[PDB]
Every structure is written in C-alpha cells, then in structure tokens.
C-alpha cells in the first residue's frame, strides 16, 4: 500500500544508492541475488518489503529504483558488481558521454536524448504501483549530471504527476571544501528550479561529515565508503514509519505539511544520533535524555553551519528502538528550558515526535556501534541563510570578470539566464530575513 | 478423431516443416526415435491428430514432404528429427524449378503432382474423420509458389467440404531475395483467394525486427525465425488436441474471422516473448500477455495495423487462469481503441481457452487477426508487378513455357479487385 520511488542521478546519487540499497536488504532479510534464505520463512501478511521491493511470482524480490547516468563507468560497476542479480537489467539506463560538469550538456544538449526513456520507466513503476506516496531523488548540486539532468527531469514529473510529494537528497557544496571549479555556477542553476517544484529538499555536505567521522568515530582519514553509509542510515530512518509498526507513525505527507511554514522556506537539515564507535559506547550509557541532547549540539550538525547564529523554526524528532513516550516528553521540555536553543516567537509549538519499534541494524564490516535506540532530527532553521550568503559571494567573483561562461553558451544556453538565477537567491536570502524578524 | 494432414512444399516449407514437427514432438513428448517418453496421460489421449500409430508403439507424422529438387531433402533427413518422417512420404523431383512460376505450375510441376496425389489420397482415407488441410510454402520461390498452389487447386476440387489453411511467406521489399518474385507473388495470390479459407501471411522484416528488440539475439539465424513461426502453428490448433474451459477448432476460427468469402487474409502474432535476461524479472500475468498482444512491434507481418482498421480478431489462450481477467481485458481494449475497429460489427473478439501451456511456460496466447491493413502488403506487389510489365522484363522465361501474356493481365485484374474491396469496407 505505502510505496516510494527512488531515482539516483549523477555519480554522487548512484554511489549513495549502492549504500542505501545494501542496507535495505539487511532490514528485510533479502540476499544480494534477490531471494530470501530457505532456512527461515516469513509470515503470510508481510508488507515490510512492499515499500521498496516488488514481489515477482518466482519468489524473487526486485527493488523499486531507477539508476540513470549519462556516463557508463559507474553503472557498469553495479552491473559487474555483487548486486548484479538484484536490479532490473533495463532500469539501469546509461548514456555515452558525460556532462563534464556543464549544466548546458545535462539539460540542453545531451540530456534531451535519454529523458524519453527515463520517464517511460517512471510511468511503468507507477502503473505497477497500487498506491504511490512520493519520490526520493538522489543527486548532488555540483556536477553537470547532478544539476543539469535533475532540472529537466523533475520538472517533467511535476507535469506528469500533479500533487505527489517530491523529496530530494542533495550534496551541498561545502564552504571551505570544493572539488570542481565550476561549483558556484552549478548550485545557482539548480536552485532556480527546485523552489517551484520541490516540497522538501534535504541538504548534506562533505566537510561536516568529515569532522563527525573524525571526532565521534575516530576515523582519521574517512573516504567515500564511510560517508555514504552514514547518509544511508538517515534515509532508512525517515522511511522507517512506512515499513514497520510504531507507537506513533509519521506518513510522508504528515511531516510534509508540518515542516514547511512558507512556500519558499523548504530546506530542512538532517541530523542523526548516536553516531558512535564500538569502544566508546561500551563505557558511555545511552539514555533517552542524552541522545536527544546530542542532536542539538553544533558539533553533530551534518551541514557546516552555526545553528547559534539563527533561530530554530520547526523541528521533527524521529526515534527508533526501545523508546517510551514518557522519556521523550520530559526530554523536550528540558530543551525548551535552555536559553541557547532559540526558537522563533511566532511558532510556539515546533516539535513533532515519531516513535518506532525496530532498532537500527549495523552492516557487517562497518564501523557504527550496534545499539538499541537512535533518533534522526530534521530541523528547519534560519541559520542556512548564512550558508547561501557565502555561495552567492563565490558566484559574484566569477561573473564579475565573465569567466567560464563561453563553455556554457556554446551548447545552447543563453548568457542572460545567469541574471534571473542570481536575483532569485537574492530574493531567497531576504525571504529568510523577512521571516526571522520578531514583533 | 479430427486429423490434420500437414502439407510441406518448397525449400522454405521444408525448413518450416522440419521446425514445426520438432515443436509438437516436444509438446507430445516424442523422442527422435519415434517412441513415447512422457509422464502425463493428457498427451497420449489426443495424439492421433498429428501422429499415426504403427507397430511397436511408434508414432509417425502424417506429413507429405514435396520438392522438385532433391538438395534440401538430404538436409531434412539429416536433421535432429530426420529419422521420424516416413521414407515413402519424400516425394522429390529430379530437376529444380529455378525461381520460375510456369516451370513449377505447367511443365515440371505437372508430372510430380500425380505421385503426390497418390500419397495424399492414401493418407486422407486412412483418417477416421478428416478435419482439414494445412500447407506451408513460399510465394517468392518456384516450387513452393508454382507447384504448391497447384496442389491447393487439385485438393479443393476433390474434397470440397473441408478447410484449407496456409502459412504462406509473403515477400518483403528490403528482403528481396529474388529479382523476379513479384511475378511469382502476383500469380500465386490469384490462385490463393478462390481455394483457401484461412491465410496467415508471414514476413521476414517482421521476424528480423523481433529478434533484435525483443529477444536481442546477436546472430538470428533461420533456426531462430522458424521457431517463432512454428510456435504460432501449434498455438492455433491447441484446443483441437487438449482439453480446456472453452474450445475452438479450426472451423470455429474460420467462421468468426471470415465475414465475406474474399476476406480470408489473417496476420498473426504470439503473446509471450521476452529476452533471456528478462525471464526471471517479468511477472507473467493476463494483462501482460494482452498488452504485448495488440502492439504492432510483436505482430508477425510487414504491415502497420494503425494504417488500417480491424475487422475481426481472435485470441487463443493457453494455461490455467481465470475467465474474469481474460474477459475484462479484451473488452477494455475494445473501449479505448474504439477507432481501430469498424462500427458495423459489434463484439469483434473471439475468446478460446485451453488448459495445457507449452513446456517451460505457464501462460501462452496466440494472436490471429483479420485487418484491412493487409491491403498495404498487396499494393506494394501490385505496383512492382506493373513496373516490369510495362517494359516486359523477364517475360521470355514465362511465355516460353506455355502461358500467355493475358494470364498476367488477369492476375493483376483480380488482385486489383481485392485491394479495391478491402478499402471499401474500411470506410
């Protein structure tokens, strides 16, 4: 009955897609080939895998996901990997030449040759779907594929499916950390689209996860295998209410209308707790009152921002495991008595709580400690306006001397479109200023 | 019971026939030796239809293998199932036809039909209750078109109250494997329309496109194409040999799909086709068969159904299933595609149900369709026939054998009347 569709675009979306879909198999007890073990049998009335997997009549489980990439060197890793018998051979769509960190190639030139095939799959997955609830698009702001191809794809879904929720998961370019040099360009060209087509767009970055991995997990030199496991646990905690039973469950629409106060303020943050190593949890006891305070410390934020500069606007606490509602209730009123956590005066009630019954599962070969309770915090703050401030400052020094423009205009993109995209984030900056003022 | 006398003429008919008698040998569990090695008793109760009993529990086909050239007879008898055909059923001439209609219909194909008609009359009278005839040939050749259509004329004047079904290989523009075959295609359909009750046009672009987009084979040899033809040939008579919820013999298909005596040109398809990688992933379900059924990509002729309007459509289903999802699906597709059926006949869809699917498969369904878009097949041959006849190209191979030039004038005159009347009932 409850269903979700996951699309992984660009290299960042697909590589996390390898990490989120390996965790989904352990939750439901599905082998990598796509079948359940013969030693144990499930009950008759099981809908736990119905959110993500579709039952084939031959006793085989097929994921409900589409993996689209314009370059073949990443998808061919999946087709030749250990999950080759899991995915559909035709859902794995590949192109010929990549976008080369160019928005004009992924949206105007090369991205228009494949999108007739891409929307064909989404039509097929939705038609087989009995009841559809939303979309889970995974990409990054930086790449030409993650920015160019996402833009014209997601506007076509809003044309096709009218009032279906659409939830991105995007890699924010970090403040001091950036790999490409066209990075201030591609972020501005994405956000011209995601304001009028997205309902909740979650942000993570590489730099804040690095410091979390350095201090909590004591991983001195983290890599891409370490980051994508941590991101994959948050998405499995968000969707945990649609798969399992809970004390009070949150649907996809229920936190969609409880988290955004204004149509142009729809950029929440993701925070997970407790991210701890195996040896530290052996000494430190995990209570309900302690893990909820771990979310609100600035060192545990997965976006490189200072939460103390702005004020909180709306929060959503999503618990798992052996959690009773009495301990949460006294834990929240402890937080509201603190003066350093500043809530806005026009939103007297800001917390929404969801409690589930299944504890988190650790992937063998991993790093995370195996625990009982864990909480994922989704917070809407005004502190991310400073994050958009320094990115526009990066854009203004590129466009002052008209650098890097002749690659963009050589594929079909107009020169003038940078002006409307720049003034949009001018409007988005003062929109956070206009709501943060008091009375 | 109701015995089907298979006929097999030409080189193309021999290779289709060698593949046809291989599939229903797998269906009835008949080894290449000739005995029976099966498990269930549903196979042996109706085995007299296609196989004939001998001593020692040996079943032999009731097939007549005819060709003017002995070259392909050695390849038939040296195949996988080459030791199961009766040695007295190989009627072979000594000299080839050479891709000429007149040589195969008047001079060299005139002496061999006396030996064939001895074999056919012996096998036809040996049946308890004969059901009909079934023939496979090629219109683009000399023996199959020239002499195969002569046997159709001679059989029809001896057993009038029977049924005649042909699986004829219509030619293609880009698979033009003979320079003279518009002469042989035109003169064959002049004989076909008066002496045949059902005609299933089989083309080669239709089969070559399927193996590229649906089966995605990299080397689609003729053994791959002849399996798809033989799959249809066993799926059309599957209720004549097996029990079911709603049976339909060969006469029931001719009654429903032929409203007029000169509208007997069907155009077939087979429902369950998927690549090797898509076997374990796709769930075989009744809407999944019907969705693939009506598409123009799986259909086995070089004519687009959207350029014409359907007259009557029959579907023969196989497998254990439920009648509600069957009966709803071809009623639902009649509702959306209301413009693709003529409005002067209601309820155009024939439903037939069996219980035994083929081996290794759970649900199967064969699509047979009458359509006025088959006029597009006969307009291409007719415009090619006139183009040489203006300049009298290749004519001396024809008028030097006995036939006059007026036979070419009446062959196009009857063929132009067929394309005149298909267009009339479309509008």
């Amino acid at each position: 009955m409850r269903e979700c569709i996951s699309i992984h675009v660009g290299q960042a979306g697909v590589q996390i897609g390898n990490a989120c879909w390996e965790l989904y198999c352990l939750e439901h007890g599905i082998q990598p080939d796509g079948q359940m073990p013969s030693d144990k049998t499930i009950g008759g009335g099981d809908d736990s895998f119905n959110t993500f997997f579709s039952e084939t009549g031959a006793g085989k489980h097929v994921p409900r996901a589409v993996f689209v990439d314009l370059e073949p060197t990443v998808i061919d890793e999946v087709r030749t990997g250990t999950y080759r018998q899991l995915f559909h051979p035709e859902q794995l769509i590949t192109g010929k030449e990549d976008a080369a960190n160019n928005y004009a190639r992924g949206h105007y030139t090369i991205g228009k040759e494949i999108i007739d095939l891409v929307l064909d799959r989404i039509r097929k997955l939705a038609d087989q779907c009995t009841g559809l609830q939303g979309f889970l698009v995974f990409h990054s702001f930086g790449g030409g594929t993650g920015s160019g191809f996402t833009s014209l794809l997601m506007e076509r879904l809003s044309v096709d499916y009218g009032k279906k929720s659409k939830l991105e998961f995007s890699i924010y370019p970090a403040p001091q950390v950036s790999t490409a040099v066209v990075e201030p360009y591609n972020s501005i060209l994405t956000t011209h689209t995601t304001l009028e087509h997205s309902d909740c767009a979650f942000m993570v970055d590489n730099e804040a996860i690095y410091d979390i991995c350095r201090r909590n997990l004591d991983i001195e030199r983290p890599t891409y295998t370490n980051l994508n496991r941590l991101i994959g646990q948050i998405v499995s905690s968000i969707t945990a209410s649609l798969r399992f039973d809970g004390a009070l469950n949150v649907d996809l629409t229920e936190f969609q209308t409880n988290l955004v106060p204004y149509p142009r303020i729809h950029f929440p943050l993701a925070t997970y707790a407790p991210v701890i190593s195996a040896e530290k949890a052996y000494h430190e006891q995990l209570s309900v009152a302690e893990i909820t305070n771990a979310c609100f410390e600035p060192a545990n934020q997965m976006v490189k921002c200072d939460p103390r500069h702005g004020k909180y606007m709306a929060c959503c606490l999503l618990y798992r495991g052996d959690v009773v509602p009495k301990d949460v209730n006294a834990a929240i009123a402890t937080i509201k008595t603190k003066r350093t956590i500043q809530f806005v005066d026009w939103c007297p009630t800001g917390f929404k709580v969801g409690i589930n019954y299944q504890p988190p599962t650790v992937v063998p070969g991993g790093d995370l400690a195996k625990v009982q309770r864990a909480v994922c915090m989704l917070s809407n703050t005004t502190a991310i306006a400073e994050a958009w401030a320094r990115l526009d400052h990066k854009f203004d020094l590129m466009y002052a001397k008209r650098a890097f423009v002749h690659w963009y205009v050589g594929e079909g993109m107009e020169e003038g479109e940078f002006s409307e995209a720049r003034e949009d984030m001018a409007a988005l900056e003062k929109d956070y200023e206009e709501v943060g003022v008091d009375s | 019971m109701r015995e089907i006398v298979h006929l097999q003429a030409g080189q193309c008919g021999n290779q289709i026939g060698a593949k046809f008698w291989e599939v229903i040998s797998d269906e009835h569990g008949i080894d290449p030796t000739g005995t029976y090695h099966g498990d269930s008793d549903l196979q042996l109760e109706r085995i007299n239809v296609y196989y004939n009993e001998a001593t020692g529990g040996k079943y032999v086909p009731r097939a007549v293998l005819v060709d003017l050239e002995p070259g392909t007879m050695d390849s038939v008898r040296s195949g996988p199932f080459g030791q199961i055909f009766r040695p007295d059923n190989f009627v072979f001439g000594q000299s080839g036809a050479g891709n000429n209609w007149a040589k195969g219909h008047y001079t060299e194909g005139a002496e061999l039909v006396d030996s064939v008609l001895d074999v056919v009359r012996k096998e036809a009278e040996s049946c308890d209750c004969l059901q009909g005839f079934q023939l496979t040939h090629s219109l683009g050749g000399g023996t199959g078109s020239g002499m195969g259509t002569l046997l159709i004329s001679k059989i029809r004047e001896e057993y009038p109250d029977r049924i005649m079904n042909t699986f004829s290989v219509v030619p293609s523009p880009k698979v033009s494997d003979t320079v003279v075959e518009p002469y042989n295609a035109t003169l064959s359909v002049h004989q076909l329309v008066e002496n045949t009750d059902e005609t299933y046009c089989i083309d080669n672009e239709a089969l070559y496109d399927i193996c590229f987009r649906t089966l995605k084979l990299t080397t689609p040899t003729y053994g791959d194409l002849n399996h798809l033809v033989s799959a249809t040939m066993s799926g059309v008579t599957t209720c004549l040999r097996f029990p079911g919820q709603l049976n339909a013999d060969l006469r029931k298909l001719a009654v429903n799909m032929v409203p007029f005596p000169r509208l007997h040109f069907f155009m077939p398809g087979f429902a369950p086709l998927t690549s090797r990688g898509s076997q374990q992933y796709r769930a075989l379900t009744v809407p999944e068969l019907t969705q693939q059924m009506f598409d123009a990509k799986n259909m086995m002729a070089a004519c687009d159904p959207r350029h014409g309007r359907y007259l009557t459509v029959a579907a023969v289903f196989r497998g254990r299933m439920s009648m509600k999802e069957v009966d709803e699906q071809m009623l639902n597709v009649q509702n959306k595609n209301s413009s693709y059926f003529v409005e002067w006949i209601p309820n155009n869809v024939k439903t037939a149900v069996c219980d035994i699917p083929p081996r290794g498969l759970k649900m199967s369904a064969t699509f047979i369709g009458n359509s006025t878009a088959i006029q597009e097949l006969f307009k291409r041959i007719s415009e090619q026939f006139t183009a040489m006849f203006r300049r009298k190209a290749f004519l001396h191979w024809y008028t030097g054998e006995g036939m006059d030039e007026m036979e070419f004038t009446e062959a196009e005159s009857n063929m132009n009347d067929l394309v005149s009347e298909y267009q009339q009932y479309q509008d």
Binding site: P72, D76, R79, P89 | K216, T218, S275, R276, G277
Partner: peptide
C-alpha cells in the same frame, strides 16, 4: 569467452 569488453550489449552475452 564473449562479451568481455563493455560495449554493444555485453550484459545479455554474459548472461547467455
């Protein structure tokens, strides 16, 4: 064998 290099429908060849 066949379909070693990753072009021109290598997946179906590796399957069959």
């Amino acid at each position: 064998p066949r379909g070693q290099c990753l072009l021109y429908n290598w997946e179906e060849e590796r399957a069959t």
